Amino acid sequence: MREIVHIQAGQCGNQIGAKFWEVISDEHGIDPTGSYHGDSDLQLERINVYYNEAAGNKYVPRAILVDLEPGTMDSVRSGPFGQIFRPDNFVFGQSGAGNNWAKGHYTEGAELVDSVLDVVRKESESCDCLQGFQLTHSLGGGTGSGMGTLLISKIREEYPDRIMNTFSVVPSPKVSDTVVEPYNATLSVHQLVENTDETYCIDNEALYDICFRTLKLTTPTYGDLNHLVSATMSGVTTCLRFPGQLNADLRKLAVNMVPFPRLHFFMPGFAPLTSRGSQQYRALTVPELTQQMFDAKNMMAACDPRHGRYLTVAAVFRGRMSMKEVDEQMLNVQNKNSSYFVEWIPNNVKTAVCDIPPRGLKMSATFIGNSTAIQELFKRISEQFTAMFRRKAFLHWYTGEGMDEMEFTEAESNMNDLVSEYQQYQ
Amino acid sequence: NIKVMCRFRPLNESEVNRGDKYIAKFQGEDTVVIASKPYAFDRVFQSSTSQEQVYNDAAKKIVKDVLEGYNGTIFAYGQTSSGKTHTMEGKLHDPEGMGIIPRIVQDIFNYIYSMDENLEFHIKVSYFEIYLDKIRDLLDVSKTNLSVHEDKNRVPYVKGATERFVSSPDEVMDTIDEGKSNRHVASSRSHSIFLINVKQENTQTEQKLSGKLYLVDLAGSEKVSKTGAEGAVLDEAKNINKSLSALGNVISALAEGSTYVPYRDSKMTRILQDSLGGNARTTIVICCSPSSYNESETKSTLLFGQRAKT
Amino acid sequence: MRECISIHVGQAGVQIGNACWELYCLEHGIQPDGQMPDSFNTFFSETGAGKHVPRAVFVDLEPTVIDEVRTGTYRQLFHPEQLITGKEDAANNYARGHYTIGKEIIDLVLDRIRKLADQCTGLQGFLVFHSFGGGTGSGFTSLLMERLSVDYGKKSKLEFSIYPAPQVSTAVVEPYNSILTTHTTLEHSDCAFMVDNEAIYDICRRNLDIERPTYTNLNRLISQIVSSITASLRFDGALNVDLTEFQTNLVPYPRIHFPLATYAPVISAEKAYHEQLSVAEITNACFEPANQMVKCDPRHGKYMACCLLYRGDVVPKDVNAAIATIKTKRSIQFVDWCPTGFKVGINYQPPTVVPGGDLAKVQRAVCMLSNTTAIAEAWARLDHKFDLMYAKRAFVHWYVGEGMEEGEFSEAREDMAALEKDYEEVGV
Ligand SMILES: Nc1nc2c(ncn2[C@@H]2O[C@H](COP(=O)(O)CP(=O)(O)OP(=O)(O)O)[C@@H](O)[C@H]2O)c(=O)[nH]1
Ligand SMILES: Nc1nc2c(ncn2[C@@H]2O[C@H](COP(=O)(O)OP(=O)(O)OP(=O)(O)O)[C@@H](O)[C@H]2O)c(=O)[nH]1
Ligand SMILES: [Mg+2]
Ligand SMILES: [Mg+2]
């Protein structure tokens, strides 16, 4: 019940969702062969929400994989927990978007999306009653952003009455991996604002700094970043998969953090994050996790929360806690930082708790803040967009493939109005 | 600025035998009292006042301003058997007590025939609905999922609207009837927007002026917990109530002098992003049956007017 | 002959039901599997030979809390029909749990309550547990109270509802749902016992000496309260107090039926030996502002009526002596138009103690239910929160998108204002 299908597009989205299936399978005791070898029955109590039962008690994901290059498919098949996936859900082209939103939203994406759409129809009819979807993509390139945007548009045309998720990795300005990040990012945000229901604005430089300083690791590879994102993703939907003393599924988090339909871009976070040496010099307790997640230097979005106000903040704890301690510490944080937390929304905190923590820790937590610092992100990108749009740089690629300048102008206008939204509630 | 002007229709013989009471109390000339509580307005037009004074007080200044290049807008609203069809069109050809829309159209065509010969007053008209959040088109059976786009001057508009020229009131009436033939009605279950675009072209000065004027026939806010609806009607009620509360929030943001106005939360407020903001008059006309049998729903209607001023 | 059905809505209601039915199965001596190795009829039926099924109906839309009971230790006591389960939760939304999702489930629970009331013969009243914050416990309970009042109407419908606190609160959108369901809390219910969580936190911190109390202890305490209410039905005391007599002596006017409760003595085992818990001490402790179930100082309010449901080793003489001491104290001030605002109740059965529980084994006990005006203060600050939510229209479009309207918000706020006005009028 309340099943979820995990759409997963782009190279970065493929890697992130692969690590997500890794961490979620480690918690359900699912071997590389898709077979169960766990201990507690609470694992299999809600296996059907993500996975699906097949011949021989083999549980397979309800996950669609999407790309315009078969190299990522080769990687996911050859990498660990590749055989768990269903081969029919592999939907790959051959062109490659090449950081061109137009190619991955008009020409190649429009021709390829029929297969993905039929496949998600099949996966949505096989269940009993789903609740919401999950798109895992990136706003930098054209494959992920464009394909996921076209796809989620078609979905909201088909299923407008289901909660929707987008676990986006926005491109930071300092970590410049490509040149046309502002174009693709803004052109995708023009559609994520009006189609999605809740978006998590993960950021690259954020996770880099978290792995440099909070964990004190010397060589942060993409595996570690993806593991952080995977812990974040699994921490959110633990209420569906397991019991608890106060449950909170996706729709509850949405309706307890989305005051208006457009103010649904959230910065996530995770705790407790500890290094190797400092793992002993750290007492796992609710005040510790609390003051560790609200720290600006434990955030997965490159936007200082101190520079803005919090509107809504959902803390989804995981462990056999005492609810009095939880509510007391969250109240004390709301009191100590009354200037940051907004005033016309009393009880800015939403809380959720479960009993089964991740495999390895005694307790854990998860953080979803709807701060107003997000505007800074949509400020910085916008500047870059103008700097690239004033002189019409790199535009003939988008123009020759089917776009027009007016769509760029509309995306900029909508994004500026979103910045104004986040400004006025400060 | 915005100005709400409420109307209470006369009672009909169908419920005089029913034994209903006239439970609509008045104070001054701009405040009603219902259920021993006052609801304020700007004008509260009564059962006795005919269409002429209501028209002269509500729609005259709008047409006077839009002919000078500005933009105007009108919001009709009401439940079933509330006086919408009587107030907006009512009589078709009778110049005595006919509705508002024919009077606007005839005033446009009577102003155009009083000007100089060097002014080509082009008159475009569009007529499109908003159903289940989809912008259908009532002048075309194929264009069922239209969308909104902007222009260089940040003036939204439907891309692909089946525009149609006109040169007389009868053509306008025929177009309105042809559009209403396809309107989703069980009882209106869909917002309708009739746009009138008056492009006046001055040849001596070489300046053009396009005045846009919206006739919005809203749908009915329906507490579905009472009605017991199931199926598509439920989703229709959901989307209708969403659009209505979004419009209310927008109008409250306007009249409260807020620095920002969230026009982009609903398509019906996206299309109207220009005609309400600044130099654009607007008048909201709500029709109500003051009978006690329709008291409960009437409260909601009055409250929809109260989310205009305060 | 007597009987009383118990409805349990939301995660709060279901977990309170777990705790309560644990208490019930323990008091009557009944094993978890129903087998009993007269008095149980007030809450338990009898499935022929060697079985006792309860007079309960667990309703909820989150399948997790109900499946926790279908697999829990009490999987054998209940049978799968009383354990109703939806598919998609209300998700902290009044409207979803009121009409959108509620219509899929309510026919079945109403059919079950018809099958469960036609089994008994002397039904005394219902018991509806729900939190004002959640979507299910507000909307579905409003709908259910409406349907029952249309069907039964006359039967004493009670609801021992959790109430969100002003500071210690878990969800963002609780004031909305609370104000929305106060309408049905007024018109259809008969006497509701509001309960706050932070009060129980403070009681567990001070007396029981637990620094880290979770919801299980709260639920055990509330179960003790309900057992104190219903021991006048279950067992036979020297001075019985039925629910109709209870309501008559406690509910003067038809709208003033929200008495806040309080239970005593609540103390740990190590603290029990030092304190001689006589009748006078436990009777005096209940009137203290610190031992109440809701955040409100009674010293700024005036009691109109209150019932003292003593149970255990009690004799009326020291009861009347302690009552005289209370009536002489000036800080505990009563309203003028009620010279005798006490309805004493004695019962022979002492309160039990659950294995693994935080309470101690005592011989005397009290459950005072003071009908006061000081509770209105909570509503005031609640309304304050609602105002801060309402003027800016936070989270409105979610409820609007499921059928709800602005007019319902306005009407509910007006009605709560009129209710506070009524309490403020009857005070003088
Ligand atoms: N947080 C992470 N970012 C990654 C990871 N792998 C790649 N990337 C980053 O994602 C950004 C580009 O996304 P992709 O590699 O998926 C290129 P995309 O699929 O969007 O379309 P094409 O350019 O046509 O290949 C870029 O900033 C990468 O540095 C990862 O594992 N984690
Ligand atoms: N005293 C006590 N309070 C509880 C308990 N469980 C939940 N509460 C409170 O219940 C409130 C939230 O309401 P819920 O019951 O969880 O929500 P719901 O009724 O299930 O409706 P949905 O969330 O939409 O599924 C919160 O204020 C909790 O603190 C409990 O076991 N004991
Ligand atoms: Mg790519
Ligand atoms: Mg719930």
Coordinates of N, CA and C in Angstrom, one line a residue, chain C residues 169-253:
Chain C
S169 N 4.3 21.1 20.8 CA 3.4 20.6 19.8 C 4.2 20.1 18.6
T170 N 3.7 19.1 17.9 CA 4.5 18.3 17.0 C 4.3 18.7 15.5
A171 N 3.0 19.1 15.2 CA 2.7 19.4 13.8 C 2.5 20.9 13.6
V172 N 2.5 21.3 12.3 CA 2.4 22.7 12.0 C 1.0 23.2 11.9
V173 N 0.1 22.3 11.5 CA -1.3 22.6 11.0 C -2.3 22.1 12.0
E174 N -2.0 22.0 13.3 CA -2.9 21.5 14.3 C -4.0 22.5 14.6
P175 N -3.7 23.8 14.8 CA -4.8 24.7 15.2 C -6.0 24.7 14.2
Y176 N -5.7 24.6 12.9 CA -6.8 24.5 11.9 C -7.7 23.3 12.2
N177 N -7.2 22.1 12.3 CA -8.0 20.9 12.4 C -8.7 21.0 13.8
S178 N -8.1 21.5 14.8 CA -8.7 21.6 16.1 C -9.9 22.5 16.1
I179 N -9.8 23.7 15.5 CA -10.9 24.6 15.4 C -12.0 24.0 14.5
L180 N -11.6 23.3 13.4 CA -12.6 22.7 12.5 C -13.4 21.7 13.2
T181 N -12.8 20.8 14.1 CA -13.6 19.7 14.7 C -14.2 20.1 16.0
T182 N -13.9 21.3 16.6 CA -14.6 21.7 17.8 C -16.1 21.8 17.5
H183 N -16.5 22.1 16.3 CA -18.0 22.1 16.0 C -18.7 20.8 16.3
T184 N -18.1 19.7 15.9 CA -18.7 18.4 16.2 C -18.4 18.0 17.6
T185 N -17.3 18.5 18.2 CA -17.0 18.3 19.6 C -18.1 18.9 20.5
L186 N -18.7 20.0 20.0 CA -19.8 20.6 20.7 C -21.1 20.0 20.5
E187 N -21.6 20.0 19.2 CA -23.0 19.7 18.9 C -23.3 18.2 19.2
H188 N -22.4 17.3 18.8 CA -22.7 15.9 18.9 C -22.3 15.2 20.1
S189 N -21.1 15.5 20.7 CA -20.6 14.9 21.9 C -21.5 15.3 23.1
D190 N -21.2 14.7 24.2 CA -22.0 14.9 25.4 C -21.1 15.3 26.6
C191 N -19.9 14.7 26.8 CA -19.0 15.3 27.7 C -17.6 14.8 27.3
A192 N -16.8 15.7 26.8 CA -15.4 15.4 26.3 C -14.4 15.8 27.3
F193 N -13.4 14.9 27.5 CA -12.3 15.1 28.5 C -11.0 15.5 27.7
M194 N -10.8 16.8 27.6 CA -9.6 17.3 27.0 C -8.3 16.9 27.7
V195 N -7.3 16.5 27.0 CA -6.0 16.1 27.6 C -4.9 16.7 26.7
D196 N -3.9 17.2 27.4 CA -2.7 17.7 26.8 C -1.5 16.9 27.1
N197 N -0.5 16.9 26.2 CA 0.7 16.0 26.4 C 1.7 16.6 27.3
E198 N 1.9 18.0 27.2 CA 3.0 18.6 28.1 C 2.6 18.5 29.5
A199 N 1.3 18.5 29.9 CA 1.0 18.3 31.3 C 1.4 16.9 31.8
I200 N 1.2 15.9 30.9 CA 1.7 14.5 31.3 C 3.2 14.5 31.4
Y201 N 3.8 15.2 30.5 CA 5.3 15.2 30.5 C 5.8 15.8 31.9
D202 N 5.1 16.9 32.3 CA 5.5 17.6 33.6 C 5.2 16.6 34.7
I203 N 4.1 15.9 34.7 CA 3.7 15.0 35.8 C 4.7 13.9 35.9
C204 N 5.1 13.3 34.7 CA 6.0 12.2 34.7 C 7.4 12.7 35.2
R205 N 7.8 13.9 34.8 CA 9.1 14.5 35.2 C 9.1 14.7 36.8
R206 N 8.1 15.4 37.3 CA 8.1 15.7 38.7 C 7.9 14.5 39.6
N207 N 6.8 13.8 39.4 CA 6.4 12.8 40.4 C 7.1 11.5 40.1
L208 N 6.8 10.9 38.9 CA 7.4 9.6 38.5 C 8.9 9.6 38.4
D209 N 9.5 10.8 38.2 CA 10.9 10.9 38.2 C 11.5 10.1 36.9
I210 N 10.9 10.3 35.8 CA 11.3 9.8 34.5 C 11.8 11.0 33.7
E211 N 13.1 11.0 33.3 CA 13.7 12.2 32.6 C 13.4 12.0 31.1
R212 N 13.0 10.9 30.6 CA 12.8 10.6 29.2 C 11.6 9.8 29.0
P213 N 10.4 10.4 29.1 CA 9.1 9.7 29.0 C 8.7 9.7 27.5
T214 N 8.3 8.5 27.0 CA 7.7 8.4 25.7 C 6.2 8.3 25.8
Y215 N 5.5 8.1 24.7 CA 4.0 8.1 24.7 C 3.4 6.9 25.4
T216 N 4.1 5.8 25.6 CA 3.6 4.7 26.3 C 3.1 5.0 27.7
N217 N 3.9 5.8 28.4 CA 3.6 6.2 29.8 C 2.4 7.1 29.8
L218 N 2.3 8.1 28.9 CA 1.1 8.9 28.7 C -0.1 8.0 28.5
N219 N 0.0 7.0 27.7 CA -1.2 6.2 27.4 C -1.5 5.3 28.6
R220 N -0.6 4.9 29.3 CA -0.9 4.1 30.6 C -1.6 5.0 31.5
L221 N -1.2 6.3 31.7 CA -1.9 7.2 32.6 C -3.3 7.4 32.2
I222 N -3.5 7.7 30.9 CA -4.9 7.9 30.3 C -5.7 6.6 30.5
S223 N -5.1 5.5 30.4 CA -5.8 4.2 30.6 C -6.3 4.1 32.1
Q224 N -5.4 4.5 33.0 CA -5.8 4.6 34.4 C -7.0 5.5 34.6
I225 N -7.0 6.7 33.9 CA -8.1 7.6 34.0 C -9.4 6.9 33.5
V226 N -9.3 6.3 32.4 CA -10.6 5.7 31.8 C -11.1 4.6 32.8
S227 N -10.1 3.8 33.3 CA -10.5 2.8 34.3 C -11.1 3.4 35.5
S228 N -10.6 4.5 36.0 CA -11.3 5.2 37.1 C -12.7 5.7 36.7
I229 N -12.9 6.1 35.5 CA -14.2 6.5 35.1 C -15.2 5.3 35.1
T230 N -14.7 4.2 34.6 CA -15.6 3.0 34.2 C -15.6 1.9 35.3
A231 N -14.8 2.1 36.4 CA -14.9 1.1 37.4 C -16.3 1.1 38.2
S232 N -17.0 2.3 38.1 CA -18.3 2.4 38.6 C -19.3 1.5 37.8
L233 N -19.0 1.2 36.6 CA -19.7 0.2 35.8 C -19.2 -1.2 36.0
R234 N -17.9 -1.4 35.8 CA -17.3 -2.7 35.8 C -17.5 -3.5 37.1
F235 N -16.9 -2.9 38.2 CA -17.1 -3.5 39.5 C -18.2 -2.8 40.3
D236 N -18.5 -3.3 41.4 CA -19.6 -2.9 42.3 C -19.1 -2.2 43.5
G237 N -19.3 -0.9 43.6 CA -18.8 -0.1 44.7 C -19.9 0.2 45.8
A238 N -19.5 0.8 46.8 CA -20.4 1.3 47.9 C -21.3 2.4 47.4
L239 N -20.9 3.2 46.4 CA -21.6 4.3 46.0 C -21.3 4.5 44.5
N240 N -22.2 4.0 43.6 CA -22.0 3.9 42.2 C -22.3 5.2 41.5
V241 N -21.7 5.4 40.4 CA -21.9 6.6 39.6 C -21.9 6.2 38.1
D242 N -23.1 6.1 37.6 CA -23.3 5.7 36.2 C -22.9 6.9 35.3
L243 N -22.8 6.7 34.0 CA -22.4 7.7 33.1 C -23.5 8.8 32.9
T244 N -24.8 8.4 33.0 CA -25.9 9.3 32.9 C -25.9 10.2 34.2
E245 N -25.8 9.6 35.3 CA -25.8 10.3 36.6 C -24.5 11.2 36.6
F246 N -23.4 10.7 36.1 CA -22.2 11.4 36.0 C -22.4 12.7 35.2
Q247 N -22.9 12.5 34.0 CA -23.1 13.7 33.2 C -24.1 14.7 33.8
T248 N -25.2 14.1 34.5 CA -26.2 15.0 35.1 C -25.5 15.8 36.2
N249 N -24.7 15.2 37.0 CA -24.1 16.0 38.1 C -22.9 16.8 37.7
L250 N -22.4 16.6 36.5 CA -21.2 17.3 36.0 C -21.5 18.3 34.9
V251 N -22.6 18.2 34.1 CA -22.9 19.0 32.9 C -24.1 19.9 33.2
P252 N -23.9 21.1 33.8 CA -25.1 21.9 34.1 C -25.9 22.3 32.9
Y253 N -25.2 23.0 32.0 CA -25.8 23.5 30.8 C -25.4 22.7 29.6

